Design a protein around this ligand. Structure first.
Ligand SMILES: OC[C@@H](O)[C@H](O)[C@@H](O)CO
Ligand SMILES: OC[C@@H](O)[C@H](O)[C@@H](O)CO
Ligand SMILES: OC[C@@H](O)[C@H](O)[C@@H](O)CO
Ligand SMILES: OC[C@@H](O)[C@H](O)[C@@H](O)CO
Ligand SMILES: [Mg+2]
Ligand SMILES: [Mg+2]
Ligand SMILES: [Mg+2]
Ligand SMILES: [Mg+2]
Lengths: 393, 393, 393, 393
């Protein structure tokens, strides 16, 4: 299994550049030069790279400094052939963002935050990014009385709609992808799950160009089914981007390599990305982006091993998911379990409520005890899927 | 503290009628006669009662039997003065619903399920119910390959839109309230949280009369902030009903008395229901419905004690939440923390993106280190709230 | 990868006999006869069967019927050759056990529960069981003031030590195994995890014959590492029996097939039972017991599929972990990461604390920053196990 | 409800000195001088202060500087009268401890870590500490094959017993207290809950002087009942110190003020430390230590508010639990529910197992169905505690 640029594996600069500082310790690794990250990822098989404005250009950087850094980074891009599919803003590390960016209680800070995003749209547009991600990690609270909850969502709408309006005004081919997370760093974050993000988008003035960026570990931190959430995002045609990593349970965000967390759930996520829905439906077409952190125990040899593991994991799952659905044994098991039956509409062509309530076959003379005897055989179909994942089939 | 019918405390027949059977044991209590439940709840101070079609009318009941049961139950209602604000359908206890009602893989079962709901709308309309709740508890899976996830949501939309269309056709004053739950009885349930429910409603043909019925313990089973979720439902004006109970953590659904689970979260939920948003916004106006289960350890003396505890808990929280917001000390603390500041729009009247990006005060000459010095004093405001809850203030 | 009696795969009569009632529904399958259970399990390759007293002998049976059911049961064991390695008592279904068996607040229920256990030890010895399991499912509370916590533990001690002394007194060749569970059906169960259960055994009078009976899903309900937990039971030489199944997250007890929950942890679980410790130490030589429940969506064909599936899953995993450890590239990776290094004692033969303190190269002259540079290469080691698991190596 | 030195409220130098860096951001407050820390804590009513070696003495300090910082530190203790009841070692921040202290895979880090601890025991004795705490924060793994689990426990044993033997050898009047934590910063920490820690102490050579140091939030991260856990530590007479704070659910370690997390459980926690057991038994007479972190949104005024808040919270709760138990209606409710009944032994003075077995009224002639009718009245008992807690009784 070898990743080729056609696989569309993208990595953020902060992923392999994650230095190791956590809540109980300092960094264990030296800073990564951005120029080296670009060359290194291109040798491993990356398609692209992504970044936060402050991953690249320091918060306090002067003008002279900004142009050097960009000169150096466009050089590298040109030399290697890597693309920049997504760009994001850091509205969480500086102490100024302690209560949030867009939903800070201080109005002057909300204004700085939105200014910092607008300037960043320009840069994203100049880099040729298709997607603009917003992760509001400081948007929320520890305490329930800290916020006016309706005001927090109005403030949130103000900023996303101003950023969308500007995109439209400037003529840029960028779509905004919002990224939900339940907790960490705040005790509770606003728009905690895929569902909250999707609901919020519908209340937006310019929601037409606003969609989601779900992350595997983030949905797993609330104990949800990551494959079920992306399937609701796909169905509403709002799956604009995706962040892939691993998580081993409800606890702090681990950011492990994709496949190094819940393995069967990873298998089924690859299946949906690659095979789509069993009865047909929309298909995800974008970057396969890995937002993980090489464990702090490992040196730089581990950093490039970890980057590699992400694409290997993904290609190994892909080989198994294609084989799985290709197996005639699996196709038969699927039909038996009613997987294609689910796709037939419940009512008949031009049948109304009234029409169905009256049908005696459907209700009054329906033999419920008889219908309850069907052996759905879900266990057998799940055993078949695991045997294809373990490659023993 | 005494509940008066003006408090609008409603109870389901299955709550106080919950008999005690759980996964490792049989019932510890005898069945509750519905006639007695109605008299008993009226003596305790209830405003109303709610039920599932099969709580009242048995699955196999004959026609003669159906009329006796309804004759008996309308008599009781007439005698006591209790109202029926909500009615729901049982699409989960009979073995026929083992794979769901609306999203069963078997098409004949989907048809029976929808027939069973349509007939139930009629009954709800005849009882004078304002709300029709749908809790799809068997909608989901244990295994990731069991379902065509897009087909599952299409099937789900079919049934809710057919039920809504019929309401409209018949002229009934009923709104549908969907009720999310992450898991139990299925390993994963479709539309797991408030956010998923809200997102789904937006894809509906007749979503105008479809809203939510959040339950305290259900959002807490995913570790979410129940007050934050109802605040997103309120903001989108989709909070049609509410189920109040307690839950002590991420585990099986406990259905404890309201206030017998996370106490501070209960305080803040009462605050939002009774005081609304600090800067103004929509207010919830419906029944305060308790969907709990009197612990199986307790006899019928405990059943009526438990029903009573629900309304006492609620009135005790209400007394404290009104006092809390009335305290001048709290009002000052709120302003200091920026709670009213959050309500001022971020941009100025007729200010555009461009206009803000250019403002030098807002970005380029913004002193971020200076702004980061503000002491939000969230801890102090949270200490003030707890002292009002403990009534030591 | 056909199990054979040599494999020591045991199954409980209540697993395959589980008819499907969950908290929101009734059974979906017909009762399973125990004679049918023995013949069917023996044709699939099981080595033995386990049961709870009331799984075979009804709570109400007269002596006549007890002896009648036992004769057909022993006949069936005789005809097939299944052994009966473990026996347990039901101290949870009947309404009398609503507050517990051994720790019921009511003294007359504690005596009845203890008498129930003592007569069950006589049947255990009669059957040839080597292990007598105690899962205290109703020992706990929903509310914190429901119990005196010190007295609850004196009452658990008194029952376990009384049962242990009787074993010793009659000269039975039996060991008691406790089974920890965090919750379900009590809100909080006493002795909730493997650790609690090991600590408790150290306060017993008859501790020498008391060990543990850990269950996969039970530790996963508290978010703990199942492999770490049994490691700790094994290291203390208290792993006397084991219950294997699947669980997908912190939620209600799912009891899936082993391998249908956290797959990667199942792999590492099989690795420790099968291979033991890398540097050598204790090993678990007991039966491999499956304590699961066939999903309720499935007929009797799914029941036997499910039972097959347990055995397959364990042999598939078994094979990959033998190949994993035999692999020369894995053994070198292990060496690099320090797995064998941890095997060496920290202090030198004869080195005292005073000695180590005084060794300038261990402390005053140690280069803490040079030592921090080591690449432990845990990501690569982890990536090697997963390729062995996916059957790619 | 003004704390006074008599109350035994202790605070760590790292709590109030916690500057705010979390995983997505830098400090938001200036460093706090330790002399300032002692004076400020002494004006608020603290009885003592605790610290980690590196909280006071930098990792790099020369001997000259160590002695210089200690002289100003002891001066400040002298001027104020604060005691120093517990001392601990930092075996987690420096990059060298990336795989652990005592259980690092690297042997030279195990020796360096142990030497670090041994010299810290000399400082502990010098200060007048009675307790030496060990939180093994980096002892664990992210991946299951990273460690040999039996060897990890031999290496934890060897370090704890070496430290214990040295204490005994020097005649220091010190006790070691272990502090369990399920995760954060390792994916899985060794000795994850109170039980694991108690079981482990029973395999030690020097067990007699080793006890526990449970922390509220740490058990709440595994979803366990904090009151049940310390009950079990207390019952085994292993509760040697206690760390109190707040946690709102299974998620990252929040370290809130005690009482700002699970309020009802805090009440019951205060009830056991303060009142002990209803039928009598052990009592915890040690210091009440607050191991928390002032939220990063707040200035230095919030830091002192937060510290005040800990003490207030505990005295408010203290008052309500003294009133709760003194109340004649609560004592009658306790009697009805069987709280004192559980205090009586199950067997009669002199009754043997054979005797109980043979008593027809305890088993053969027992009316299990009449006994199942008892109303335990646990809901009312629970409702009485909450009205005492809300200060309504
Ligand atoms: O939880 C942290 C988030 O996952 C970020 O890495 C974003 O994806 C981009 O700000
Ligand atoms: O989890 C069970 C649900 O809460 C039901 O009680 C509904 O509210 C109505 O079907
Ligand atoms: O959660 C249920 C427990 O696992 C029981 O099945 C015991 O193993 C047998 O009483
Ligand atoms: O989670 C962190 C632990 O609580 C530590 O603060 C120990 O108590 C002291 O090393
Ligand atoms: Mg992300
Ligand atoms: Mg409900
Ligand atoms: Mg079991
Ligand atoms: Mg601590």
């Amino acid at each position: 299994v070898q990743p080729t640029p056609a696989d569309h594996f993208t990595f953020g600069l902060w992923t392999v550049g994650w230095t190791g500082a956590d809540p109980f310790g300092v960094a264990t690794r030296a800073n990564l030069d951005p120029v080296e990250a670009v060359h290194k990822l291109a040798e491993l098989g990356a398609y692209g790279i992504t970044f936060h404005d402050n991953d690249l250009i320091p918060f306090d950087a002067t003008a002279a400094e900004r142009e050097k850094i960009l000169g150096d980074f466009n050089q590298a891009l040109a030399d290697t052939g890597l693309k920049v599919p997504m760009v994001t803003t850091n509205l969480f590390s500086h102490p100024v963002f302690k209560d949030g960016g867009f939903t800070s209680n201080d109005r002057s800070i909300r204004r700085f935050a939105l200014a910092k995003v607008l300037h960043n749209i320009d840069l994203a547009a100049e880099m040729g990014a298709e997607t603009f991600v917003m992760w509001g990690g400081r948007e929320g609270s520890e305490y329930d009385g800290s916020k006016d909850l309706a005001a927090a969502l109005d403030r949130m709408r103000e900023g996303v709609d101003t950023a969308a309006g500007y995109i439209k005004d400037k003529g840029y081919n960028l779509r905004i992808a919002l990224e939900p997370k339940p907790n960490e760093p705040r005790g509770d974050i606003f728009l905690p799950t895929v569902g909250h993000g999707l609901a919020f988008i519908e209340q937006l003035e310019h929601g037409d160009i606003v969609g989601l960026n779900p992350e595997t570990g983030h949905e797993q931190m609330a104990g949800l089914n990551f494959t079920h959430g992306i399937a609701q995002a796909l169905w509403a045609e709002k799956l604009f981007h995706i962040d892939l990593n691993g998580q081993r349970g409800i606890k702090y965000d681990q950011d492990l390599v994709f496949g190094h967390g819940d393995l069967t759930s990873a298998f089924f996520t690859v299946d949906l990305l690659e095979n789509g829905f069993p009865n047909g439906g929309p298909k995800y077409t974008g970057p396969r982006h890995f937002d993980y952190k090489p464990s702090r125990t490992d040196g730089y040899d581990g950093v490039w091993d970890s980057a590699k593991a992400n694409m290997s994991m993904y290609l190994l799952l892909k080989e198994r998911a294609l084989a799985f659905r290709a197996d005639p044994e699996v196709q038969e098991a699927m039909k038996t379990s009613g997987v294609f039956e689910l796709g037939e509409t419940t009512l008949n062509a031009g049948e109304s409520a009234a029409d169905l309530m009256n049908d005696s076959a459907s209700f009054a003379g329906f033999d419920a005890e008889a219908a309850a005897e069907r052996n759905f055989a879900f266990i057998r179909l799940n055993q078949l899927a695991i045997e294809h994942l373990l490659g023993s089939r």
